[PDB]
Nucleic acid binder design. Structure first.
Lengths: 134, 277, 274, 271
RNA sequence: GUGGAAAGUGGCCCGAAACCCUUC
């Protein structure tokens, strides 16, 4: 089922927290394995669906809505730990695998980065999602 | 020969590539529109009688394509001896799809040297299935009427081997007059250079009406209504063949209108040394 | 003669998108972009204008004197050409308006602004509707993706089973300026004022009716924001360093441009007039 | 045979839907760039037309001479006899369903539905004479969406049948109750005697749509559209040809119960 | 003095039918 290469791929993403100036296959080649660990545990979609709506709305705010996501990125950062605190037993044992990636990414990526800088993270946000079903 | 070029930046589709005589029709209607009624090509008779038009391809970038020195079709196997013994089929690329060539593969596509064919051709001869409509009701009537369609940065050009006084007096005002939608047109003048060796027998660069002198030439048949009544067929040499036993095939007077339409076909040389024939 | 080539240059915003078809897909020439073909713009721009003068033929009748032998109708009941109802020209199924002679079509206000043919007539259309080609905002918008088309699905809902069926449409994205242009020959200077007023009338019939395919349920609703009325009298071609009219550009609403600033725009072109 | 328009009466819409709205696509339906809700014209036109022809199906027994080409039909259904024309007031197999389409011109010129929503078929194909704009979300809710306070909130249903309720759920993502959709609707006016019995014939359908729903699962809510009109104005050919900034404007006070401004239809009207 | 001159890929079509976010 779960094997230690998969949290070590998560640890490559979490300790090599810098993906922003990296290759566009460094995202996808890890995003399978990440989601593989994220589908090795349960991680059903409907509690993750609160996160993705905050992405797509801020993605439309990227597409000529504002200059950046300055204050609204906090509630993207907040609601992950909120779901962690809400998660109980069969979920907080598992949902932290989704949690341990977006916080250390968005830490320095709340440096008010460019829309072309954040799009490289939003593509990873999308990139995790489909391999839940695959 | 430092003959200048005229690059026509399009903005969209053309009906056809203008076939080196339809411009001289269009130049005629242009100088019929401007300059009154008697500064028209009757007055420009002795001025195109020493200077030529001779259309050619688009460019697709800045690589000014040029049609073919047709004097490489006889002894193509005499050219490509340097290749391996599977050179036939590159000859079929340089005979059957032999359409247009780069300049660097045109100063040595003649003069008996191993040229190379290009492939970035800015054609989209597309099949645009246009209009179907009745003013009150349905209409089914898919009548096609296809047109040509270009690339992103391409465009037709043509040449001008003449004195620049005559160019800027008739044709250069007319080349901005030309600018149903397919007349999309922005004009940008230029100069050009061609190496062009000794002038025994060489290319015409136009569509051609010769004076009875046949040497290795694709035949053409060009119609054209040209203010109403259908012009005759007027058998032509195609783009770029070799009639240089002293040409000067005069423009042909026609009949049908009040003032005569008279069709182009007078050519201008280049440099080729052809193998035999 | 020729004292001509008025350039109306502008941008047409499709407020709810377009469906100039060819799954039905839009016309996409060589780069994958869509575009309004200038054929469709001229065609809808003559259908609206021809039905306008179909309603209004019996009352103009002195201005445009050749439009008096018609007495409105279509010649689809009496299946013959040249029938005096309004319009014959049976092409394959349709019936459009074309005057069958040049001498008549020097005066028919629709026909002398989009031309005439058939047998021994040959009137040139006096207008050049350039195809509009996706101005440089939405070209650079397209380069990063942005999905310039939009697959839209409708259904034929029944009422005794309430079943349905996919009929996809794939229209252009709602809101896209297209770099719209119009070139017009200004032969017969006495005709010209009413002529470009009539072209602006036909364009003002748009923004209130459907361009582009399956209209009347969305899919049309275009807006001309045309910037620069120009002029190219007879000196723009023999020369062209200077000396041509450039009109006001910014917020010219076509339902207000038609006369409320037009005679303030006409009189500068009256300054050349030759 | 003539189209012969002079007219284009327009109504400026404003369908503030209350209690939800779920129009569907491939989830609400904004395919263009400004992600939003909107009502795409054709879902309003088809819900107008099917409801109006359901009214005409029951009320054909008393008009029956007015709109004379209606009298070629029966109030039944072409469901059992699967022929594309049967003599009943339902025909025109689309792919598996049936809609009312008069397959002629002169039978469609008089038909009280088909003179207002267009014919099709062999050789005939009447133009619909009504123009149903795509209803985009108004500028007020655009400004109130830029500032947070989100529109298009989701909603979960379940299939809790009369078994052990292991009900598989299904989210729907309807539009929030209260959404001004800035609607616009144009009707081409031709040959005036053919006119006053048309928009009065039209609004009743919208009145029925004021009682019924549009947009999706309307049997469990999701309707209540409340067409609070804005313009009721009319744009004659006397200024499409010569635009002097003049127009013939009606009044949009609250609504009409049943055609209270039938008298004010003809206030300054000859065409 | 232009293989020309006139020629809306158009007309019709609800993304609809049903479903208690509730039980153990």
């Amino acid at each position: 089922q779960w094997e230690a290469i998969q949290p070590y791929f998560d640890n490559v993403v979490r300790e090599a927290k810098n993906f922003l100036e990296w290759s566009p296959n460094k995202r996808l080649a890890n995003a399978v394995t990440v989601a593989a660990y994220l589908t090795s545990q349960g991680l059903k979609t409907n509690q993750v669906r609160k996160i993705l709506d905050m992405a797509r709305t801020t993605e439309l705010k990227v597409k000529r809505g504002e200059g950046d996501i300055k204050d609204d990125l906090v509630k993207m950062r907040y609601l992950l730990a909120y779901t962690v605190g809400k998660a109980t037993g069969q979920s907080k044992y598992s949902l932290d695998a989704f949690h341990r990636i977006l916080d250390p990414m968005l830490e320095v990526l709340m440096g008010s980065p460019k829309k072309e800088n954040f799009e490289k993270f939003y593509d990873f946000l999308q990139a995790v999602v489909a391999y839940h079903k695959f | 020969p430092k003959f200048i070029a005229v690059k026509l930046i399009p903005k969209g589709p053309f009906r056809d590539i203008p076939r080196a005589d339809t411009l001289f029709g269009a130049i005629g209607n242009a100088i019929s529109a401007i300059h009154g009624q008697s500064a028209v090509e009757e007055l420009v008779d002795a001025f195109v009688g020493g200077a030529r038009i001779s259309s050619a391809f688009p460019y697709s970038g800045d690589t000014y394509y040029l049609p073919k020195p047709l004097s490489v079709e006889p002894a193509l196997e005499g050219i490509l001896t340097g290749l391996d013994e599977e050179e036939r089929y590159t000859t079929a690329k340089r005979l059957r799809k032999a359409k247009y060539l780069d300049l660097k593969n045109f100063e040595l596509a003649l003069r008996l040297r191993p040229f190379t064919i290009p492939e970035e051709i800015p054609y989209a001869r597309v099949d645009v299935p246009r209009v179907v409509l009745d003013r009150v009701t349905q209409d089914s009537s898919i009548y096609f009427w296809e047109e040509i369609r270009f690339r992103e940065k391409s465009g037709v050009y043509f040449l001008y081997s003449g004195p620049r006084e005559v160019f800027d007096g008739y044709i250069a005002p007319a080349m901005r007059f030309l600018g149903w939608g397919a007349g999309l047109f922005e004009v940008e003048f230029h100069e050009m250079k061609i190496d062009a060796p000794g002038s025994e027998y060489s290319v015409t660069l136009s569509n051609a009406l010769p004076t009875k002198t046949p040497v290795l030439w694709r035949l053409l048949r060009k119609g054209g209504w040209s203010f109403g009544r259908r012009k005759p067929r007027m058998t032509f040499i195609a783009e770029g063949s070799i009639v240089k036993n002293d040409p000067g095939g005069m423009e042909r007077l026609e009949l049908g209108l009040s003032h005569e339409v008279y069709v182009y076909g007078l050519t201008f040389p280049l440099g080729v040394e052809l193998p035999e024939g | 003669r020729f004292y001509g080539k008025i350039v109306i240059k502008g941008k047409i915003k499709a407020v709810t998108g377009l469906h100039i078809g060819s799954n039905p897909v839009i016309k996409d020439p060589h780069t994958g972009l869509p575009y309004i073909p200038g054929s469709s713009l001229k065609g809808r721009l003559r259908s609206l204008f021809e039905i306008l003068v179909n309603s209004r033929l019996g009352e103009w009748r002195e201005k445009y004197p050749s439009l008096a032998n018609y007495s409105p109708g279509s010649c689809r009941p009496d299946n013959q050409e040249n029938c005096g109802k309004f319009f014959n020209r049976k092409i394959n199924r349709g019936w459009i308006h074309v005057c069958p002679d040049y001498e008549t079509a020097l005066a028919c206000p629709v026909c002398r602004l989009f031309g005439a043919s058939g047998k021994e007539s040959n009137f040139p259309s006096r207008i050049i509707v350039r195809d509009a080609f996706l101005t440089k905002e939405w070209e650079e918008k397209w380069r990063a993706g942005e999905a310039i088309t939009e697959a839209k699905i409708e259904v034929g809902i029944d009422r005794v089973t309430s079943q349905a069926n996919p009929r996809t449409n794939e229209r252009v994205v709602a809101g896209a300026e297209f770099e719209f242009e119009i070139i017009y020959n200004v032969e017969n200077t006495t005709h010209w004022r009413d002529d470009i007023k009539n072209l602006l009338t036909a364009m003002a019939l748009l923004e209130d009716s459907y361009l582009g395919g399956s209209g009347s349920r969305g899919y049309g609703k275009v807006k001309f924001i045309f910037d620069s009325f120009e002029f190219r009298p007879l000196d723009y071609y023999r020369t062209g360093k200077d000396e041509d009219i450039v009109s006001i550009d910014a917020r010219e609403k076509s339902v207000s441009d038609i006369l409320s600033g037009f005679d303030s725009l006409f009189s500068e072109v009256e300054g050349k007039l030759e």
